[PDB]
Structure 1
Amino acid sequence: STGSATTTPIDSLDDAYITPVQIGTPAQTLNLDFDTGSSDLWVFSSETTASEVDGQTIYTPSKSTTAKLLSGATWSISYGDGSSSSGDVYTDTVSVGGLTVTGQAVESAKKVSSSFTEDSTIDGLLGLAFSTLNTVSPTQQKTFFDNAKASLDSPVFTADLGYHAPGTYNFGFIDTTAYTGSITYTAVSTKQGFWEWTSTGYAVGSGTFKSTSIDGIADTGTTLLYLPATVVSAYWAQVSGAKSSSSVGGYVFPCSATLPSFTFGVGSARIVIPGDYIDFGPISTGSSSCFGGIQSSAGIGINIFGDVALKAAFVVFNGATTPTLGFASK
């Protein structure tokens, strides 16, 4: 079997991408944030504290003939940005673009942090990292991808994120019409539960490529590109007037500047991020200081190839017994 669904930016800055997901019988359609950096499928629901819901579509398990409460199971998650949520667990039927999984763990939020309440466009998250990171207790649960794997034509999914435009998540097949040239595959470490890999180096604009190993994770759930301080300093040094601002919390640059591209290595291949992808607009309405899309990972503890990098490529998440990541230009 296969599945295919369109994913759409939630705002004019590509801060996140939402994908419609059908849950329950009859179907309740929610717009979820597909997150390859986490492994919980959780949703706003009829159980969520009423004051913490502001425009989201909610899952109502009592209206689903296939929902079953998972007795005694709870979940609680904290994301690297300080966001968090928690609740109880149902199993139900979940379908993504024609691909159906029965008995999927659907984690119903009882409590969500402020950053989720204020994001009216995101009804929940669909985690696509490895199931070892799932937070359900006392019985860990599998991700949508792990549950679907056996029935997929090929144990893969692909992310084709658009720049200020819709894109596609495909399950079970690789669309050879969606990219140019060849796909370059690179090894993955699952030791931390992430799609963790090693980039072979970088270049700034038309400058010389620097061969150096950068270990990081492919994370559709993170907006920006977070890289070591040395690399990020080298990039912003090429932008006139750019500086790191402690009050703003990262590199900013004059909105009138043109940004250089950023190249990262995948084996012997190169992925080029156009400079326009790195502009995240004024730091406040009306400001002439703009926020940069490449920031330092120093405070994080891990390098993150977020949407800024992934949307420049066609990305294959190969969940074979030895997992790999594939990158192609598009």
Structure 2
Amino acid sequence: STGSATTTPIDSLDDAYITPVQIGTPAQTLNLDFDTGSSDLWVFSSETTASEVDGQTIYTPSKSTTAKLLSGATWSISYGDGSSSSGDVYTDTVSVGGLTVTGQAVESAKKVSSSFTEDSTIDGLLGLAFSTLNTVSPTQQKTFFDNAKASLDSPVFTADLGYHAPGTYNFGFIDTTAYTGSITYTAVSTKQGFWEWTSTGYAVGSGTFKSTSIDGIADTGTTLLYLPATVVSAYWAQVSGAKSSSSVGGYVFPCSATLPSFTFGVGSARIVIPGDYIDFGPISTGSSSCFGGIQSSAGIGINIFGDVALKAAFVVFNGATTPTLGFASK
């Protein structure tokens, strides 16, 4: 089997991407944030505290003939941005882009933090990291991908995120028309439960490539590119007037600037992030200070190849017995 679903930016900045997911019988379609940096499939629901729901579409398990309470199971998750959610668990039928899993754990939110409430476009998350990070207790649950894997033509999914445009998540096949050149594969460590890999270095604009190992995660659920302070300083030093602002919470730059590209290494291959992808616009409406899309990972504890980086590539998440990550230009 295979699946193929279009993923759409939630706003004009590509802050996140939503993908329609069918849950239950008859289908309830919710728009979920596919997150390769976490491993819970959770939804706004008929159980979510009413004051914490503001415009989201909810899953109502009582209206699904295939929903079953997973008795005694609870979940609670905290994300790197400080947001969180928690609740109980149903099993139900879940379909993504024509690919169906029966008995998927669907984590029903009883509580969500303010950032979720305030984002009316995101009806929940669909985690695609390794199932060892799943938060369901006392019986840990598998991700949608893990459950689907045995039925898939090939044990893979691909992320093809757009810049200010829709893109695609495919399951079970590699669309050879969706990228240019060849795919370069690189080793993954699952030791921390993430799609963790080591970039071979970077360049700023037309500058020389610096060969240096940068361990980080491929994380579709993080907007920006978070890298070591040394690397980030070298990038922003090439932008007149750019500076790190503790008041704003990162690097800012004059909105009048033209940003240089940023290149990262994947083995001997190179992925180029155009400068425009690094512009996240005014820090507040009407400001002439703009927020940068490359930020320091210092104090996160991990480097994160978020959407800024991933959307510059066609990315293969290979979930074979020995997992790997592939990157191609597109």
Task: Return the TM-score normalized by structure 1.
Answer: 1.00
Question: Following TM superposition, by how much is the alpha carbon of 1:299 offset from its aligned partner in structure 2, in angstroms?
Answer: 1.5
Question: Following TM superposition, by how much is the alpha carbon of 1:19 offset from its aligned partner in structure 2, in angstroms?
Answer: 0.1
Question: Following TM superposition, by how much is the alpha carbon of 1:238 offset from its aligned partner in structure 2, in angstroms?
Answer: 0.1
Question: For the residues of structure 2 that align with 1:178 and 1:4, how far apart are their CA atoms?
Answer: 13
Question: Following TM superposition, by how much is the alpha carbon of 1:33 offset from its aligned partner in structure 2, in angstroms?
Answer: 0.1
Question: Following TM superposition, by how much is the alpha carbon of 1:31 offset from its aligned partner in structure 2, in angstroms?
Answer: 0.1
Q: Residue 13 of structure 1 aligns to a residue in which SS?
A: coil
Question: For the residues of structure 1 that align with 2:48 and 2:181, how far apart are their CA atoms?
Answer: 47
Question: For the residues of structure 2 that align with 1:206 and 1:299, how far apart are their CA atoms?
Answer: 29
The equivalent of 1:284 in structure 2 is 284
Q: Residue 175 of structure 2 aligns to a residue in which SS?
A: coil
Question: For the residues of structure 1 that align with 2:299 and 2:242, how far apart are their CA atoms?
Answer: 20
- CA displacement, residues 134-166 of structure 1 (integer Å, 9 cap, x when unaligned): 000000000000000000000000000000000
Question: Following TM superposition, by how much is the alpha carbon of 1:268 offset from its aligned partner in structure 2, in angstroms?
Answer: 0.2
Question: Following TM superposition, by how much is the alpha carbon of 1:213 offset from its aligned partner in structure 2, in angstroms?
Answer: 0.1
Q: In the alignment, is residue 316 of structure 1 matched against residue 316 of structure 2?
A: yes
Question: For the residues of structure 2 that align with 1:272 and 1:91, how far apart are their CA atoms?
Answer: 42
Q: Residue 145 of structure 2 aligns to a residue in which SS?
A: helix
Question: For the residues of structure 1 that align with 2:286 and 2:299, how far apart are their CA atoms?
Answer: 29
Question: Following TM superposition, by how much is the alpha carbon of 1:226 offset from its aligned partner in structure 2, in angstroms?
Answer: 0.1
Q: Residue 70 of structure 1 aligns to a residue in which SS?
A: strand
Question: For the residues of structure 2 that align with 1:96 and 1:249, how far apart are their CA atoms?
Answer: 36
Question: For the residues of structure 2 that align with 1:81 and 1:287, how far apart are their CA atoms?
Answer: 24
The equivalent of 1:201 in structure 2 is 201
Question: Following TM superposition, by how much is the alpha carbon of 1:110 offset from its aligned partner in structure 2, in angstroms?
Answer: 0.1
Gaps of 5+ in 1: none
The equivalent of 1:34 in structure 2 is 34
- CA displacement, residues 188-244 of structure 1 (integer Å, 9 cap, x when unaligned): 000000000000000000000000000000000000000000000000000000000
Q: In the alignment, is residue 213 of structure 1 matched against residue 213 of structure 2?
A: yes
- CA displacement, residues 73-103 of structure 1 (integer Å, 9 cap, x when unaligned): 0000000110000000000000001000000
Question: For the residues of structure 2 that align with 1:295 and 1:226, how far apart are their CA atoms?
Answer: 5
Q: Residue 116 of structure 2 aligns to a residue in which SS?
A: helix
Question: For the residues of structure 2 that align with 1:292 and 1:63, how far apart are their CA atoms?
Answer: 44
Equivalences for 1:240-319 in 2 at 5 Å? 240-319=240-319
- CA displacement, residues 256-283 of structure 1 (integer Å, 9 cap, x when unaligned): 0000000000000000000000000000
- CA displacement, residues 110-148 of structure 1 (integer Å, 9 cap, x when unaligned): 000000000000000000000000000000000000000
Q: In the alignment, is residue 107 of structure 1 matched against residue 107 of structure 2?
A: yes
Question: For the residues of structure 2 that align with 1:329 and 1:53, how far apart are their CA atoms?
Answer: 39
Question: For the residues of structure 2 that align with 1:114 and 1:316, how far apart are their CA atoms?
Answer: 33
Question: For the residues of structure 2 that align with 1:71 and 1:61, how far apart are their CA atoms?
Answer: 14
Question: For the residues of structure 2 that align with 1:40 and 1:287, how far apart are their CA atoms?
Answer: 37
Alignment length (residue pairs): 330
Question: For the residues of structure 1 that align with 2:217 and 2:144, how far apart are their CA atoms?
Answer: 20
Question: For the residues of structure 1 that align with 2:134 and 2:287, how far apart are their CA atoms?
Answer: 41
Question: For the residues of structure 1 that align with 2:79 and 2:279, how far apart are their CA atoms?
Answer: 24
Question: Following TM superposition, by how much is the alpha carbon of 1:69 offset from its aligned partner in structure 2, in angstroms?
Answer: 0.1
Question: For the residues of structure 2 that align with 1:85 and 1:189, how far apart are their CA atoms?
Answer: 27
Question: Following TM superposition, by how much is the alpha carbon of 1:11 offset from its aligned partner in structure 2, in angstroms?
Answer: 0.1
- CA displacement, residues 278-307 of structure 1 (integer Å, 9 cap, x when unaligned): 000000001000000000000100000000
Percentage of pairs with the same residue: 100
- CA displacement, residues 3-61 of structure 1 (integer Å, 9 cap, x when unaligned): 00000000000000000000000000000000000000000000000000000000000
The equivalent of 2:224 in structure 1 is 224
